[PDB]
Structures are given as structure tokens and as C-alpha cells.
Symmetry: C3
Subunit: 312 residues, 3 copies
């Protein structure tokens, strides 16, 4: 199609730059400047809104394209093959076109607010400046093709079941774990501290399992889960804690997403994460909250998962 | 005997409830409500007094019964066999009967003071309520049989050697390590943070080695060590630190207990604990005190253990 | 030679004491009393000045003697063989004689200022007092022989290249990493907390690789690197941070030292250290500074090492 053909031209203009970027740099785990949790949450919210509006089949295709790309990484910089680079850009171009322009610009505007003005210059300083410029020009040409195919209105909200077994169980899980949820420091920078002894390539293989799971999940269930998070962000208090009702809706929605893929797909994610998560991490998190409430939340979770397991 | 026969009936009434309890829940490592170190210490003191008054042979028998019970654990809830459940209840019933009623009630009263009123309800909410009630009724019947065989007066204090080699060495160890003892935060909740990466079943196998060692130890030496701790609790200051003289008496008493079992029994405990203790734990403890005093205490300990080793 | 012959007599008088010292005691990692970072830095500075003035070939010989001595350690106290003890004392005696008396006394005076008056007594209390006294008398006799051979003037400063590839690269590394250097708490006691799960004998084998590397390094490059550190100490601010220019000079000097030994020698040090450094240590250090600046410093380092690698 058009976007696919345009992606090939984008590749001719940008692959040199892609080969120069040090993709294994740990700096990408950090905020693009000073961390501002609540301001960053507004940007995440715009992305969630956009994700919920995008075509589920195109999102699925874009996830598969990244899974394929991870398989061809090579060299010390961790760059994917030229064919995969084009495949990813085409798939993302299609996703962008499935959403109205204002949604895309909202993301750009909110991310700009939290990005330090010096970030682009520092990033360009690590590569060949001419190649970066050449890549950007390629991008400007590519976005015109995407724009021509872009829709003018957003698709409607997902269908949410009511009173299903998962929804009822999620209510019990939520009441039991809300005290624990309120104790977590949602505004801490600890979440961006790296995993001890794990390289970027090791982390990538674990993230790959999640990408694969997302590609397999029910598109509507995923869309509803994103919508539930957007609503939850609207009710947060000053410390970032959402309302008990919105928390319950988020848990029910996630339970339906889990039940939409086979058990083996979910276990692959768990096993991969268990391989990269130092045992001191769960302990460090546990030590910052009330130990009775953490155990109450955990017991409720192991009870809730039996209902999800039966539906799955 | 009577208690043995009554334990079998207690089992018919309570084993269903025992099978329902999730014994692997980590909540049991936590205080039954808000942690109140000094108030909890009063309850531990009542238990120590009771332990020192109990018949040493019956305490030994009850420890052996638990060691046997650990060997038959099965299922996801970690429940011991019906035969072992009865064996444990009978052995404990006999221990309770070897101590006067007021001592037993003192424990109950002091533990009630630190237990949150909502604890029993929360525990009952996780099992079949009817089965719990049935188990409690079984307990009320069982305690009447125990009461009929209960002594009316407490046995006398243990015999403590004087000026033996261990007692003299303990004096040197105590003088050398008291500065370190004073620096430890005895009122901290860090002691109840779980062992990183260790399941309840793994911890249980390590605790089993200690139970085995206790069953092998000299009953009089154990009794004297408990009495020494009761005295030490009497002289604590506002931060929970006992007097130097009481500390020395505790060290001498523990040294005698160690020398009452063969070296292999003590090494089995050490090796099992080494297997479940993350190397960051000793470091975390060390970092909270004066490093010179911790090394002075450690050097004194490695010197003291040579005297215990020779006596053993 | 004279010092060699005198070392043999020193050995007859001191080896008994050497066998009694518990060399595996972790107390030697701690300051000899209360930690006083800035006062201790003055003592290190005197040692640096002395090291830069000593004969490079004699320093190299003394390093080799320690490497040999590590190979003959035996027993629970970690004592080297009698032959190696003498070899070490002789080699050190020769180093001491290659430097003027005032430099040696300066070290003694500055170390005395930070050492608690009770340290010698505590150390003597752990060994046979008569043997310690006998060893000290042996030392007093030995130092007279060293004194007779001692030079009267210090050798001149090392020759430093200018505008070489390493020097230019060091400038870029220093500019990129200075913000990170300023954020580190140079006055913290964390640097003296032990390595989790690593015995003194395990640490010794890792330190052995560094001793071997130092013995292989270019004597002039080492001398220049020591001189660069002495200058750097002169420009520190109140928090212990040296000037940007002195920092750059230190980096260039160290880069030349690294390029003066083959790659395999440097990798042996890295592999040995990787074996004793818990993965939580780099994380703990990273969590105390700005994460963006740490990643910028790291990226700059991986770029700088390519220039060192080519020169090597
Ligand atoms: C644990 C939690 C998980 C984490 C959560 C997710 C993390 C979210 C944070 C992501 C951080 C993104 C930061 C990367 C910055 C890259 C933006 C870029 O370099 O920006 C470069 C631009 C270009 O600047 C240029 O500056 C000038 C130079 O161009 C000139 O030069 C020539 C080519 O060289 C051309 O011919 C051009 O026409 C000519 O004018 C011109 O004005 C250009 O038109 C242009 O404006 O800078 C600008 O716009 C201004 C800067 C804008 C700020 C960044 C927003 C834009 C892109 C990000 C939004 C997408 C969302 C990302 C996250 C979603 C997925 C994770
Ligand atoms: C550790 C490691 O190894 O990680 C490895 C992981 C991988 C995955 C293997 C890997 C890879 C590949 C990667 C990351 C590729 C990333 C590609 C990103 C493409 C992003 C695109 C196209 C974004 C857009 C946004 C658009 C917006 C367009 C508009 O808003 C514009 C402008 C103006 C509006 O008026 C109109 C508009 C039309 C609305 C556009 O049209 O397109 C790599 C490199 O190997 C690294
Ligand atoms: C198309 C699209 O865009 O997709 C995008 C969609 C998203 C959602 C945005 C996205 C994402 C993120 C994803 C998928 C997250 C996935 C999370 C999965 C979590 C799974 C968990 C917790 C699984 C487990 C399994 C466990 C098992 C525990 C036990 O067995 C144990 C050990 C021992 C037994 O004795 C008992 C037991 C208790 C039984 C456990 O306890 O937990 C992504 C990647 O961006 C892609
Ligand atoms: C900065 C900021 O303020 O952020 C704010 C952002 C928000 C969004 C507003 C906000 C919020 C709400 C949040 C985060 C809620 C998160 C909820 C997460 C729920 C996750 C769930 C249910 C995961 C699972 C995984 C499951 C796996 C089940 C199985 O694998 C198991 C075990 C065993 C297998 O044998 C069977 C199986 C079935 C395969 C399951 O059953 O369920 C908050 C708190 O306000 C913070
Ligand atoms: C992680 C894990 O797997 O852990 C596993 C570990 C094991 C060991 C294998 C295991 C097990 C077994 C367990 C815990 C059994 C516990 C049994 C406890 C029995 C307690 C008893 C009888 C207590 C009492 C107290 C009494 C008091 C009586 C009186 O005061 C009363 C009322 C009134 C006074 O007027 C008179 C009185 C007479 C003075 C009584 O008479 O009796 C299990 C379940 O498998 C879990
Ligand atoms: C009937 C009854 O009720 O019984 C009850 C009685 C109690 C008491 C209440 C009870 C209990 C608790 C018990 C038993 C506690 C037992 C504690 C044992 C501690 C043992 C220790 C520290 C052993 C060691 C061994 C070590 C060895 C170190 C070395 O070898 C090492 C590595 C390397 C060599 O080169 C040097 C070395 C230095 C030689 C070490 O350094 O330490 C229980 C369970 O409730 C039951
Ligand atoms: C909250 C509250 O306030 O709590 C307060 C409670 C108190 C009680 C009032 C209180 C107090 C005092 C306390 C805790 C004192 C604790 C003393 C513990 C002493 C432990 C000892 C000696 C253990 C051992 C183990 C030994 C093992 C020896 C061997 O294995 C070794 C190595 C090697 C083998 O080859 C040979 C061996 C021989 C087999 C040994 O030789 O000795 C305080 C501080 O006030 C706090
Ligand atoms: C964990 C472990 O196992 O570690 C193991 C590591 C090893 C290396 C294997 C090991 C070993 C060996 C060791 C440490 C040996 C150390 C020897 C130290 C010797 C130091 C010497 C001679 C120092 C001096 C200083 C002198 C100063 C002399 C003067 O100033 C004096 C007075 C007065 C002035 O007027 C004149 C003067 C002339 C200027 C002197 O003349 O001599 C061991 C023991 O096995 C432990
Ligand atoms: C005669 C005399 O007195 O000598 C005295 C002289 C001194 C100087 C005072 C002295 C001393 C101290 C000494 C020698 C210090 C030595 C320090 C050596 C540091 C070496 C380092 C950092 C080496 C590395 C190697 C690395 C490799 C990283 C990578 O390969 C990795 C993993 C993975 C690849 O994919 C990428 C990669 C990135 C390539 C790394 O990242 O770092 C001593 C002992 O007192 C003796
Ligand atoms: C208490 C107090 O205040 O202290 C004050 C003391 C001071 C001194 C005044 C002060 C200061 C300055 C300081 C500490 C600066 C320290 C700089 C250290 C630089 C170390 C460097 C360059 C090490 C290396 C190692 C290298 C290894 C390279 C390789 O192995 C690599 C990777 C991979 C192989 O394949 C190839 C290779 C080539 C073999 C290299 O390339 O470089 C400060 C800050 O003021 C604090
Ligand atoms: C159901 C579900 O799971 O959904 C999940 C799905 C996902 C995908 C996993 C997910 C996600 C992430 C999301 C949506 C990412 C969104 C990315 C959006 C990028 C937008 C970009 C780059 C927009 C712009 C706009 C630009 C404008 C540039 C110009 O106008 C400017 C200024 C000025 C000049 O005059 C002209 C110009 C030069 C043209 C441009 O430069 O770029 C999420 C949140 O997890 C939800
Ligand atoms: C030498 C040495 O090593 O000793 C060591 C030995 C050990 C064993 C390891 C050790 C230990 C722990 C110890 C001693 C545990 C003691 C447990 C005691 C439990 C006591 C209980 C349950 C008592 C009660 C009383 C109750 C009363 C109930 C009723 O009256 C009530 C309210 C009102 C109604 O009208 C009638 C009623 C319903 C009848 C009941 O409900 O329960 C220690 C401390 O380590 C020392
Ligand atoms: C190029 C490079 O890499 O260099 C590196 C090389 C090294 C070696 C690795 C290095 C290092 C460390 C250094 C230099 C160590 C220096 C040690 C010096 C020790 C000096 C001592 C013991 C001096 C004294 C003086 C004393 C005086 C005693 C007496 O006068 C007293 C009071 C009073 C009586 O009346 C007479 C008396 C009894 C006679 C004595 O008792 O002892 C460094 C810093 O890393 C740099």
C-alpha cells in the first residue's frame, strides 16, 4: 500500500542514522530531563486515549512487527535489520493514520512539556549529525503520506461486559487491596532504577514476551482496558491514587485481557520476568508499605487468579 | 493416656479446619496488628517463664512431634498428616498440663493485649466458618481433659554451674561485645522483613534443624537458658538493652546449651541457615552499627567458640 | 645486599608475631578510630608524594614480592611463609631507602594524627605480648640498616607527554563526567562497608591481580599518575571535589598507565573484581547521584576506552 511504499523510502533516508544510535544506552530508561510524575502522567493519558482510539488489528500488526524486529538485532549498538526497520515504520504509520490528527498532536504537545530543550541536541551529538538531519527530512516526507490516509473521526468506545465472573471477583480483589494501593509512593523515582546485573539485551528478551502476549490478546479487551485506565487517571487525588471504583474497573478489565490469551502465553511472560528480577526488588517494595496490607492484597490476588484461570 | 485419647477426638473435630488454613501465608511472620515491641516483649517474657516451668522431657517430646509433622506436609496449603496433627496436639496438651493454670492464663492475657480485635475474624474469613467453629468446640472439650491432669504448683529453678570454663569465657565475650549490643536498634520492625527468595517451605526445612537441635539439648541447660533470659528482660533500659551482667549470664547459659549437643547437630543448623540467608542481610545489620565495635564483637565470638567447642 | 641480610635477622625476631596475627580480621578494612576523611586524605597525600619519589624498579620488585607471598598463605590466620615474609620486608626496606627521611617521617606523622591512641594496645592484646615486643625490637634494629643506605635527596618528577591521543580523549571524558564526579559523596563511610559474601582470602585473590598489573606497568607512567593525584588533592573544594583541570590530568595519566600493560592483564583485574562485586553495589552508588549524569559519564567512558585500547 501507500504507507508501505513510503516506509521503504523513509528507510533509505534513515537507516544510516539508526545504525549509529547506541540503543543499549541505559539513559532511555530515564525521564527526558527532570522527573515530573504528575506532568508525565498527563502525557501518558494522551497516549492511552490515542491507543484506545487506534484500530485494534493495526495495533496487533505493529506489535508483531516489533517482535520480528527483536529477532534480527545485531552489532554492538543493538540495531535491527534494514527490512525490519522498514516493516516497523510502515506498521506504525498505519496505526497513526487510524487515529485523528488532534489525538496525535495532543501526545506531541504533552511530551514536549516534560522534555528538556537540550535533549534533542545531546542525542544528535552522539551520532553523525548529517545522517540525523537526513533521517529527519525522510520523516517529514513520510508523515505527508500518512496524513493523506488519516481518518477524520475517532472510533467509538469498546463494549464492556457486566456482572461477569471476572468483574465480580475483581470487586473483591479491589476492596481487599485498596489499602495497599494507597500506601505505595506513586511519585517516587525508584521505578526507573535499573535491574541489577541485567543488560539491555537481556531486558529486551523479557519485554519481547509481553509484546507477543499483547499481539495475541483480544483487541476489544485491550481497548476497554486502556479506556478503564484513562478514566482512572481522571479520579486521582493529590498523591496520585485513583478512586476505589475506578481501581475495580481497571482490575476487571485487566483480568479479561489475561483470560483472552492461553495460559502458556502468560506463563512465558512470568518466567522471563522472573529471570531478570532481583529478589531484593519485591523486598524493597514490600518494606515501604504496611506488611499486613501487602499480605492481604497478595492473598486476595492468589484467590482472584483462580477465577481468571477458569475463564481462560 | 487420657490426653492422647482426647487428642484423637480433637482431631476428628479440627482436621477439616486445619486442611483449609493456608499455612504458607507470609502474614504469620508479622505482628497480629500494629507492632509494639516493648508490649510484645512482656508477652514473650510470660511464655519464657512458662517454658522454664514446663517438664523438660515433655518439651523434648513436643519438639520431636513437630519434627515428625514437618516430614508429612503435603498439598498447596502445607498441612501435615492427620496422624501428625493429633500427635502434635497430644504432646502440647501434656506440656500445658505440666505447668500451673495461672502461667498459661498469663500468656493468653499478655498476647491478647497486643492482638488487634479484628485478627480472629480476618483469619476465619479465609476458611470455612462452620469448620472453624467445629474446631473451636473441639478445642473447648480438649482443654477440659488437659485441665483435669494439670499440676497445681510450678517446678523449681534449674541448677546453674559456676566458674566453669564456659562461664569465664562468656565474661570476656560479653565485655568485648556489649558496646555492639547497645548499638543495635532492638525496637525496629526490620526483623520481620522476609528472607529474599525463600518460600515458607524452604524456611520450614531450616527451622526443622533448630527444632531437632532443641530436642537433643540438655533439658536442664535449656531451662537455665530460659531463666537467664527472663532475668535479662527484667533489667532492660528504655531502648530495650539489658544490663551487662545479665547479658553475660545469657551468653554463659547459651554456651552450655550449645555444648550439650554434638558438633554435627549445631553445624546442621548453621548450614541450613546459610542456605536461606541472603548475603545482604548481615551487611544491612552491620551498616547500622559502629563497624569497629561489630568487628570487636565478632573477633571475641570466634575466640569464645573455641572454649565451647572444647567442652562439647 | 645489606638490607637483604638484615631482613633475615628481622625475620628471626618477628615471624612468631606474624603467625599470631589474625590477618583475616575484617577490622583492617576500617579506619583506625573515628573516620576523618579530610584528615586521612592528608596522610594519603604524603604517601602519594613518597610513592612518586621512590625508585620505580624497587616499587616493582616490592609488588612482585607481595604477589609471591600471597601464593604461600596457609593456616587459619592467613600467614605467608617465613621465606616470603623476609622477601617482603627486604623489598620494602629497599623502597624506604630510595626515598629521603623527611618523606618517610611525614607519612608517620600524618597517620599518627588519625590513629586512635588505643589502637596499638588493642592490636597487641590479640597476640602474645612478648612476641610483639620481640618483633618491635627486631624492627628497630632493621631500620638502622635501612637508614645507612638511605638517599639524601628525592628524585625528580616524571616526564609527561602532551597532546597525545590519550590526553585529548581524556579531555572529552572529563568534561562529560565532571557533573557526575561532583555529585558523589566523597566523605561517606560507605566505601568501607564490606563486600557481601566475600571472605578476606577471596578478596586477596582479586587484589593479587591488581598487584600483578602494577608490577607490569611502566614505572614512569605510574610515577606520573601518582604526581597527578598529588596535584589534584591540592585543588579540592570543601566537599572534596578536585578542579576540572586536575581531574582531566588524572584521567589522562591513568589512561597511559592502562595502555602500558597488555589487554589480558587488565581483563584479569576486571574478571576477578566482577567475581567479588555484588550487583547491588553499582546500583546503590547509582541511586545516590543524578541518573542522567551517571549515564552520560558511562557513555563517555565507553568511548574513551576505545582510544586507550588502540594505544595499548
Ligand atoms: C517507566 C515508565 C515508561 C516510560 C514512559 C514513556 C516515556 C515517554 C517519554 C519519551 C521521551 C521522548 C523524548 C525524545 C525526544 C525526541 C524529539 C526530537 O528530538 O525532536 C526533534 C524536533 C525537531 O526540532 C527541529 O528544529 C529545527 C531544525 O530543522 C531544520 O533542519 C532540517 C533537517 O535537519 C529540516 O529541513 C527542517 O525543515 C529544518 O527546519 C526545525 O524547527 C524543525 O522543523 C524541528 O522543529 O524538536 C522538537 O520538536 C522539540 C522537542 C519536542 C519534545 C519531544 C516531543 C516530540 C517527539 C516525542 C513525542 C512522541 C511520543 C514519544 C513517546 C511515545 C512512545 C514511547
Ligand atoms: C535495546 C534494543 O536493542 O532495542 C532495539 C529494539 C527494536 C524494536 C528491535 C529496534 C527498533 C526499531 C525502532 C525502535 C523503530 C522505531 C520507529 C518509530 C517510528 C515512529 C513513527 C513513524 C512516528 C510517526 C508519528 C507521526 C506523526 C505524524 C503527524 O504528526 C505529524 C508529524 C504532523 C501532523 O500534522 C500530521 C500527522 C500525520 C498526525 C508519523 O507519521 O509517524 C532497535 C532499533 O533495533 C532497538
Ligand atoms: C497490541 C498492543 O499494543 O499490545 C500492547 C499491549 C500492552 C498491554 C500495552 C502491553 C503490555 C504488557 C503486558 C502484556 C503485560 C503482561 C503481564 C503479565 C503478567 C503475568 C503474571 C503476573 C503471571 C504470573 C504467573 C504466576 C504464577 C505463580 C505460581 O506458579 C508459581 C510461581 C508457583 C505455583 O506454586 C503457584 C502460582 C501462584 C500459580 C504469577 O504469580 O504471576 C505491550 C507490551 O505494550 C503491548
Ligand atoms: C503516577 C500515577 O499516579 O500513577 C497512577 C496511575 C493509575 C492508573 C491512575 C493508578 C492505578 C491503578 C493500577 C496501577 C492498577 C493496576 C492493576 C493491575 C492488575 C494486574 C492484574 C489483575 C494481573 C493479573 C495477572 C494474572 C495472571 C494469572 C495467572 O498467571 C497466574 C497467576 C497463574 C497461572 O497458572 C494462571 C493465570 C490465570 C495465567 C491475573 O489473574 O491478573 C494509580 C494507583 O492511581 C497510580
Ligand atoms: C509453613 C508450614 O507448612 O507450617 C506447617 C508446620 C507444621 C508443624 C508441620 C504444621 C502443624 C501443626 C500445628 C501448627 C499444630 C498446632 C497445634 C496447636 C495446639 C495448641 C494447643 C493444644 C494449645 C492449648 C492451650 C490450652 C490451654 C488450656 C487452658 O487455658 C484454658 C483454655 C483455660 C484454663 O482455665 C485451663 C487451661 C487448661 C490452662 C490447651 O489445653 O491446649 C502444619 C499445619 O502442617 C503447618
Ligand atoms: C524442646 C525445645 O523446646 O526446644 C526449643 C528450644 C529453643 C532454644 C527455644 C529453640 C531454638 C533455637 C535454636 C536451637 C537455635 C540454634 C542456634 C544455633 C546456632 C549455631 C551457630 C551460630 C553455628 C555456627 C557455626 C559456624 C561455623 C563457622 C565456621 O565454619 C566456618 C563457616 C568456616 C571455618 O573456616 C571457620 C568457622 C568459624 C569455624 C558459625 O559461625 O556459627 C527451638 C527451635 O524453639 C526449640
Ligand atoms: C526487644 C528487646 O528489647 O529484646 C531484648 C531481649 C533481651 C533478651 C533482654 C536482650 C538480650 C540478650 C541477647 C539477645 C543475647 C544473645 C546472645 C546470643 C548468644 C549466642 C551464642 C553464644 C551462640 C553460639 C553458637 C555457638 C556455636 C559454636 C560452634 O559452631 C561454631 C561457631 C563452630 C563449630 O566448629 C563449633 C561449635 C562449638 C559447634 C557458640 O559457641 O555460641 C536485649 C539485648 O536487651 C534485647
Ligand atoms: C588477608 C591476608 O592473608 O593478607 C596476607 C597478605 C600477605 C602479603 C600475603 C601477608 C604478608 C606480609 C606482610 C603484610 C608484611 C608487611 C611488612 C611490612 C614492612 C614494613 C616496613 C619494613 C616498614 C619500614 C618503615 C621503615 C622506616 C624507617 C625509618 O622511619 C624510621 C623508623 C626512623 C627514621 O629516622 C629513619 C627511617 C629509616 C626513615 C623501615 O625501615 O621499614 C600476610 C601476613 O600473609 C597476610
Ligand atoms: C608497583 C606498584 O606499586 O604497583 C601499585 C600501583 C597502584 C596503581 C597503586 C596499584 C593499583 C590498582 C590497580 C592496578 C588498578 C587496576 C584497575 C583496573 C581497571 C580495569 C577495568 C575498569 C577494566 C574493565 C574491562 C571492562 C570490560 C567491559 C566489557 O567487556 C565487557 C564486560 C562486555 C563487552 O561486551 C563490552 C566491554 C565494555 C568491552 C570494563 O568495563 O572495565 C597497586 C595494586 O597498589 C600496585
Ligand atoms: C576523599 C577525597 O576527597 O577524595 C578525592 C581524591 C581526588 C584524587 C582529589 C579526587 C579525584 C579524582 C578521581 C578519583 C578520578 C578517578 C579517575 C579514574 C579513572 C579510571 C580510568 C580512566 C580507568 C580505565 C580503565 C580502562 C580500561 C579499558 C579497557 O578495559 C576496557 C574497558 C575494555 C578492554 O577491551 C580494553 C581496555 C583498554 C583494557 C580505561 O580505559 O580507563 C576527588 C574526586 O576530588 C576525590
Ligand atoms: C489498547 C492499548 O493497549 O493501547 C496501548 C497501545 C500502545 C501503542 C502500546 C500505547 C502507546 C503509545 C502511543 C499511543 C504513542 C504515541 C505516539 C505519538 C507520537 C506523535 C508524534 C511524534 C507527533 C508529532 C507531531 C509533530 C509535529 C511537527 C510539526 O508540527 C510542528 C511541531 C511544526 C512545523 O510547522 C510542522 C511539523 C514539523 C509537521 C511531530 O514532530 O511529531 C499505550 C499508551 O500503551 C496504549
Ligand atoms: C526451656 C525453653 O526452651 O523453653 C522454651 C519452650 C517453647 C515452647 C519453645 C517456648 C514457648 C512458647 C510458649 C510457652 C507458648 C505458650 C502458649 C500458651 C497458650 C495459652 C493459651 C492458648 C491460653 C488460653 C486461655 C484461654 C482461655 C479461654 C477462656 O477463659 C476465657 C478467656 C473465657 C471463657 O469464660 C472460658 C474460656 C473459653 C475457657 C484460651 O482460649 O486459651 C519458649 C518461650 O521459646 C521457651
Ligand atoms: C607510583 C605509585 O604507584 O606509587 C604508589 C606506591 C605504593 C607503595 C603502592 C603507595 C603507598 C604507600 C606508602 C608510600 C606507604 C608508606 C609507608 C611509610 C611508613 C613510614 C613509617 C612506618 C615511619 C616510621 C617512623 C617512625 C619513627 C620512630 C621513631 O622516631 C620515633 C617516633 C621516636 C623515637 O625516638 C625513635 C624512633 C622509634 C626511631 C617509625 O616508627 O615508623 C601509594 C600511595 O599507593 C603510591
Amino acid at each position: 500500500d501507500e504507507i508501505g511504499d513510503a516506509a521503504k523510502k523513509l528507510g533509505d533516508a534513515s537507516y544510516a542514522f539508526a545504525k549509529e544510535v547506541d540503543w543499549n544506552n541505559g539513559i532511555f530508561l530515564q525521564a527526558p530531563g527532570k522527573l515530573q510524575p504528575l506532568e508525565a502522567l498527563k502525557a501518558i493519558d494522551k497516549m492511552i486515549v490515542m491507543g484506545a482510539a487506534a484500530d485494534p488489528k493495526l495495533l496487533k500488526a505493529a506489535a508483531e512487527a516489533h517482535h520480528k524486529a527483536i529477532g534480527s538485532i545485531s552489532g554492538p549498538n543493538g540495531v535491527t535489520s534494514r527490512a525490519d526497520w522498514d516493516n516497523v515504520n510502515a506498521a506504525l504509520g498505519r496505526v497513526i493514520a487510524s487515529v485523528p490528527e488532534n489525538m496525535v498532536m495532543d501526545v506531541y504537545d504533552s511530551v514536549s512539556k516534560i522534555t528538556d530543550p537540550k535533549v534533542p541536541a545531546y542525542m544528535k551529538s552522539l551520532v553523525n549529525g548529517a545522517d540525523a538531519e537526513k533521517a529527519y527530512e525522510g520523516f517529514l516526507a513520510f508523515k505527508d503520506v500518512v496524513k493523506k490516509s488519516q481518518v477524520t473521526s475517532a472510533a467509538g468506545p469498546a463494549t464492556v461486559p457486566s456482572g461477569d465472573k471476572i468483574g465480580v471477583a475483581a470487586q473483591q480483589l479491589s476492596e481487599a487491596s485498596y489499602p495497599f494501593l494507597k500506601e505505595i509512593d506513586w511519585l517516587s523515582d525508584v521505578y526507573m532504577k535499573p535491574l541489577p546485573g541485567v543488560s539491555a539485551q537481556q531486558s529486551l528478551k523479557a519485554i519481547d514476551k509481553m509484546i507477543v502476549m499483547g499481539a495475541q490478546a483480544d483487541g476489544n479487551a485491550l481497548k476497554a482496558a486502556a479506556e478503564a485506565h484513562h478514566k482512572a487517571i481522571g479520579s486521582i487525588d493529590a498523591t496520585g491514587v485513583t478512586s476505589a471504583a475506578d481501581y475495580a474497573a481497571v482490575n476487571a478489565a485487566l483480568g479479561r485481557v489475561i483470560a483472552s490469551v492461553p495460559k502458556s502465553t502468560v506463563m512465558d511472560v512470568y518466567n522471563a520476568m522472573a529471570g531478570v528480577t532481583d529478589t531484593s526488588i519485591p523486598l524493597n517494595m514490600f518494606s515501604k508499605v504496611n506488611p499486613l496490607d501487602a499480605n492481604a492484597a497478595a492473598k486476595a490476588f492468589y484467590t482472584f487468579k483462580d477465577v481468571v484461570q477458569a475463564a481462560q
